[PDB]
Design a protein around this ligand. Sequence first.
Ligand SMILES: O=C(O)C[C@@H](O)CCc1ccc2c(c1)Cc1ccccc1-2
Ligand SMILES: [Ca+2]
Ligand SMILES: [Zn+2]
Ligand SMILES: [Zn+2]
Length: 163
Amino acid sequence: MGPVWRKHYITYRINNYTPDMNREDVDYAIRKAFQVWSNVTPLKFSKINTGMADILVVFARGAHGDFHAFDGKGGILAHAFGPGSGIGGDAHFDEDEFWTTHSGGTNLFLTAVHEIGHSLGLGHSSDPKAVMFPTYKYVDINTFRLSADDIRGIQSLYGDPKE
Ligand SMILES: O=C(O)C[C@@H](O)CCc1ccc2c(c1)Cc1ccccc1-2
Ligand SMILES: [Ca+2]
Ligand SMILES: [Zn+2]
Ligand SMILES: [Zn+2]
């Protein structure tokens, strides 16, 4: 067993914004990415704009204070820390990527779903169909669905939604 959030009500806050997409689009990509996970577990996600959140969403480039320096455009697109206190649960996106609403470059929604998986406690999958597969790949955001491995992985940690 590994660390999990010990409550079902989880807050997130967007620390700062990429200049690559307007605010509405960043907010929606992130909201929609939490929604993918909340759809298959008992978890509830809420955005806050003040106070300390459980999960901080940050856009940063190169070294940014966590011993895990980003590496410019390409390579690592983002990273996240599992459930814990302090930096635990936070999701960092490499500001050097070009973030898009679709496939124009690095899709934020898809990348966020993968990172939130990490913030919830999931590690990598060996199933090429899984969002937790280590390698980024675009899929139409209207056609996107967690794979069966993602769902069983997340439910083993938090159970399924209630009656
Ligand atoms: O957190 C990490 O492991 C580092 C990161 O560069 C991997 C980002 C990533 C990894 C995998 C995927 C995506 C993004 C988007 C996607 C859509 C559909 C299926 C898989 C993936
Ligand atoms: Ca990078
Ligand atoms: Zn970081
Ligand atoms: Zn990953």
